[PDB]
């Protein structure tokens, strides 16, 4: 059973914008450069953002985390009962990743994916930020999350539900303009409100933004000013109506968005499904 | 499986009688006009009460509420499995109720009744009580509660726990005259002591009262005297021996009674079942 | 330095009717019957409240309390340098009180007066109520508060603050009719909000009312049906604006009214003068 | 010795605007109109802001509160040894303010002051905001603050501290182009870090802006949508580097600006004079 | 000023039968022998008791502890200034005492008394207890407490509190037979109800008892088992009626008794002098 | 299901030298000496550690305990079913031990093992420490860990979690030289991070260490001194990456090892498999 | 009134030498360099320690801060009646050190002293630490402490006691060999146990060390290794008996050591004047 988000990577065309990008306005600690790619940290783990050279300037795979090799057994026997076809990572690629076991697969739309379990912790090199932040939230919680754009959200949703084993959360009727409204379907497989959010967008990106959360608001203060000096930022801060994250978004090198946020509110036992006609309480003011 | 009263709707002669008395008297918040009717908030969702014009002048339906799609799937089934004709509401409802999903049916006795998930939040527009109160207790416990009178309290009982799913909480034996009592029993289907309570009274509504909790004693008091002005209290301040609640009892246009109270004690996995011969420890003395 | 009201006693018509009165309807602990009348518990001290034999049928004395032989020396220093006549109480009166020193003397409009030092403990004889009442507030509050009804508001303030050092807390302007506008003024010697109380009201008695605090709402509630059974009950229950107390007003025997309350805030050094031009901020309707 | 800034009173030429403006965008309560003009409430006081017809388009008077009528009679007399021209307010200015006692004069520069006791409280009109704003910060910190504009600082200081007794918290140097620097001066008179700031900028009126704090970050957030949606907002949200306040600023109908924050830090006996050399740690861009 | 009783010395006819008893019936750590007898521990100080070999089985001299060099000179000269021959004790002494500077006198009926600051403390060693004992109370309250037997109680007292500057906590008329009455003064010099008390005992002795409190109610009923089985109990379990202090009396080898206690109450600003008749609220019933 | 490691058993070659280190140097309390060896304790058990007169200088046997009756039959038919020699202890046998129950057995690599149920508590004999330590931690947690040494990890990994039910918690891949990496499996069977850990070492014992926590740095901090007097520290202070234990290890008589920390975290139902490539975070620098 | 030590200066041969081991092996934050020297940060201020070119490899002078302009003017004054040569700093020094106002003169023995008010805050420019350190602790206790190294420890007592207010807190009885014995004295000026020590060592310097204080255990422990690397270490990780501060020893490139610790206890009202015979309660092995 997936826990969290563990890791991202991502091919892009300017590796260093996005090593300036990553350490110097968002305040990831740089951990070094393998086969991997250039390698960033966030806390504890050895890493949970890679970037590698790549013509796609977008996420190139993303890791899932199980607890144990009995989970991944059991994700695996899913995937392959759902006729995924599901590739047993060699001991070559569990090493790059720092993993102790893996299996690799795509999503329904092409998105590589790696499930794995035990992830190697690097509490002898304790974290150092690139740029003043207190911290960030991960734990239990794993890595944050991102939105996968899709062309049918329901092959989509079938696919994360019913093999992945994400929960929904909520819904949120997006309405982009008079004759389109786009339905955004919130997931999570852990406290953490959302780890997935799946919708139709006519982006061409795999995903619309993918999220760090931050210990303290003025983490996210300082951070919008750093970013803002560059132009580039998307949105103002602003909360949305259903993780309560208090956030901005800003442009990576690649086009796709970074959310940076604080303060979300999590799922519990006694959450039931709701939905919304806005994504946002106040602020989030597109400045794009 | 159940989780919550969510809504209910009244069918009323006067409606600007109930828009003044909701908003004013109770601290309600108007929530704008639709084909569903007069809406009125307590919190965050879009509506919990909605107000139409109709000659019954009582609860016209009740709406709960399960955590998901799964969870209407599940009250369906066992509705079928129990003989009751159930119809799945139509778009055209679910969009004037402003739900995902939902499944109609009535009680033993004619109730118009409600089961949906998803219904709509609207964090964005911030609650404004119509009235000073410092706010409504719903959360996990939903709405509040309402005394259903029937003709027999067996077969009520019956259905509302083999079918519906509630728990008994406890059983007060009312006292009606030297030659009647009439036992009043108070059902539980989440942590609030009871949200659905069964009595045979000789009364010509459907219900004996519906109730809203609200978050201090303030807001009773001050509510009282707002209710007291117009000369609609029906029973003094008090507790009750079984829910603990302190609260007051005042006539609704419609002839129901509505009770306002505070500081309920909630049910727990320790509960054990109990028999009072007394509904209040003191006050609630009658002035109808 | 006055530290609170410690003692009160009463010369009432009907001794019995105040015994019972005192400990089936408010629930105090009868503590025997000595030359210094019927004593009668609210806490560790052998007596709070005196009954005597006596034609007034009102208030007979009070007693301040100080917390040692020097500041009873420093009172009656304070008093004598007024041109108060004080008597040092003889070692007879000490012991009839049960206190270690005292002085007499009267405020400007008769009443008898006495400030103390060193007053009896009866740790060894644990209080029991006479009616169900989770306890009572003393401690450095001491007994509770009462309202001096004099015919000349200005001299007894000057009295009460310039010689006996009471400090304003609050005033509240008392229309009692179109005509008829009277200031009532609250003092304060302590945390209590008031200790007593001083206004200018046409009444036969020395005070308006005494007042006893109990610990919880139920306290208060459970003592109004015991009143309220006898048809005793002269306000309902309400929450002043000034001390934010919860309470009841009652008919004692003697015509006084004895306010039975809970939850007064207290005053602290930030504490600044204000006024009000209402007694109650809900409740307390006139049932006299 | 002053306690807090109690009220303050403008003069402007459109009291509709006004009025919409403070109810409407901030969420202030209407509290009616009087001789002393249209009344808002933000707490349990009678009235915090006046507002009145006048040319100026600007601050009228402010009141500032001392404890009790001794407070008063020390201020009238520090005043009076400093050579200050005092008017002991007349019992129909003390009405008219709904204050027991005051005194009136004026700042060095000519701004009207007022110096009073006993104000008005109305808890029997519970406070119920214009707009959705969970609470304004008063109690023992005041009204909030204003920054008085004026042509000599250090004049303007030699009064505050020095007559008035404030106490000077820190000193921020405001760059104002590469040849000007202004120092501004923040002084306080209780917790609140500043309740009254001095700076001789080049503006046409008696203030920059007054401060109104609010009890979350939400109700911030909502604000701003709300007074952005007329294009009213000068300063995005920041926090500021002296008293920690997360707030944004805009344009009243009178051209004075308004500050509107959240989460200041307050001064304790621990606290040391620093200086600045920004007045924000992040945010507050000038959209001006 | 004195902060708290620092320090005893006893002087025994049986040594080795107070070092079996202080280690293994009450559990102080024993901590060697020097000059100043066989020192005893029950916290970080190098030693709190002396035992030595003596002839009048009773304790020998008392150590009040003052802050610094400051406080000694302020109470030597209060001394002399009262007339009592005081002795600067000599580098000898202080080092025979470990502590850094002390003055020694005697009360007005014989007992050496000594007043000194800066004790040893022995970190570097670690208190561990002769018995299972969990701790002992003693920081900002010191030692414990003792009650002085004197011949004359009013003379006592005048030299405590007007010369030693003690303070009142309460009195308690002990009932010793028809006809005898004696008041028994308890005083404080710190938070400790009383750290000396006074009485006018018939007894062979200087002090009726000295007393040790203890961290847990365990640490005395182990300890209570421990002195019964040798058949030294003198009084049962119980609570005293002042200090509310849950304790046993034993009889130590030289007759003086020794009362082991935990939980007592402390004093405070707001406490005020009282009287008891009784000096235990449960227990202590005399087996002696 | 095993609940935690209860007992162990040393069989040495200097029964004195392990008595002296044990209660001089760690603190342990003596229990006294029977038929099981010289028993010592670290809580109300009445023994934790037994030494026996023996040639091998090691580990002879440990007792894991389980929760009664019912759990001793559950393991028992466990390990039949697994085709392990399972002997029933005797009365003898269970008598010597101070248990209810236990049946005997041994590791893959002959470490007799025994599971036992209802030992004996004694509460009536407080534990007192032979040095001064404030406290060790068992409870749930049990006695600590120690570390097998056995010549085939899978084999033993096998045997410990599919047989005796012990979970991972984590790996250190141990860097032995350049050609040697052996990888450390953690296990926990409750709380505590691991009460058994598994590694391919080559020593002569059956285990490297084992390990007991305390309840405070200090206790760790004068241990340490304790044990560096007589030369028997082999690691100085660090924190372990795993387990965040702060702690040394020494020497013990027989040339095992002991751990003796404080500090470490716990798992709990969150917690997922992880790898570490140092066993340290800071210190444990080898003085071996 | 002195409040703390705020700022030190160093003179070294090696400046590049001092900002690596301030920056990486402490984790200071480098500040810039201005014709105030090298700055490093601990905190939010703009400076704590300033690193100059000098031939004399030690301290080079000391700012103490006061709360204001009044404070500094009381300092001065006290400093002219005690017949020091005191000069008040120019615009020039006050702009150099970034503060409002000082005075400048020597200690005794020829230490530059400096005694200022208004130092700059920096809050829009985050700290970051050099290195991973989660914080220092500074607030209302100042930079932390250092030992001033002196030939006479009276003169020197007298200078800092009686004119510039540091008080006692506690004395330790330094062994240094046979027939010396070295008092060594250590006071406070605020809540830190002590933010100055006297002792006459025979040292070429003028200070023994100085002293930083960090957040957690773990801050203390990455840096002694961090140090330990580079084999800077002169005691190793032990605990005061004064201040109770878990803390290790390195040299600085200038000789003069730096002590790094955490967990110290502070100084209240209660605190006595006490004496030690030991520095150290465990650790601290000399490592020199
Ligand atoms: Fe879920
Ligand atoms: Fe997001
Ligand atoms: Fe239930
Ligand atoms: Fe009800
Ligand atoms: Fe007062
Ligand atoms: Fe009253
Ligand atoms: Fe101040
Ligand atoms: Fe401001
Ligand atoms: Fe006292
Ligand atoms: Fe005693
Ligand atoms: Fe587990
Ligand atoms: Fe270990
Ligand atoms: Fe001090
Ligand atoms: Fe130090």
């Not at 199980?66 to 899913?78: E, F, T, Y």
């Not at 978004?249 to 303060?263: C, L, N, R």
Request: charge should be negative.
């Amino acid at each position: 059973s997936i826990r969290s988000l563990g890791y991202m990577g991502f091919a892009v065309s300017d590796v260093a914008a996005w090593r300036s990008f990553l350490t110097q306005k968002l305040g990831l600690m740089e951990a070094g450069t393998t086969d991997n790619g250039d390698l960033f940290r966030i806390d504890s783990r050895a890493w949970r953002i890679a970037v590698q050279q790549g013509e796609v300037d977008d996420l190139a795979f993303a890791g899932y985390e199980v607890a144990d090799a009995a989970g991944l057994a059991q994700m695996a026997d899913k995937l392959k009962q759902a006729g995924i076809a599901v590739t047993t990572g060699d001991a070559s690629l569990a090493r790059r990743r720092g993993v102790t076991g893996l299996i690799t697969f795509a999503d329904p739309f092409g998105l590589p994916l790696e499930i794995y379990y035990g992830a190697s912790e690097v509490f002898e090199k304790p974290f150092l930020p690139g740029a003043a932040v207190s911290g960030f939230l991960t734990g239990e919680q794993g890595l944050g999350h991102f939105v996968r754009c899709v062309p049918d959200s329901d092959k989509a949703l079938a696919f994360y539900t019913d093999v992945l084993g994400f929960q929904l959360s909520d819904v949120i009727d997006m309405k982009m303009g008079p004759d389109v409204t786009v339905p955004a379907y919130f997931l999570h497989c852990n406290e953490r409100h959302h780890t997935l959010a799946i919708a139709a967008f006519p982006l061409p990106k795999r995903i619309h933004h993918f999220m760090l959360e931050v210990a303290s608001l003025d983490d996210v203060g300082f951070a919008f000013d750093r970013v803002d000096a560059d132009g580039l930022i998307t949105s103002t801060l602003g909360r949305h109506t259903n993780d309560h994250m208090v956030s901005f978004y800003a442009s990576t090198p690649s086009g796709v968005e970074v959310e940076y946020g604080w303060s979300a509110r999590t799922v519990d036992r006694s959450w039931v499904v709701v939905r919304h006609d806005s994504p946002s309480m106040w602020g989030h003011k597109s400045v794009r």
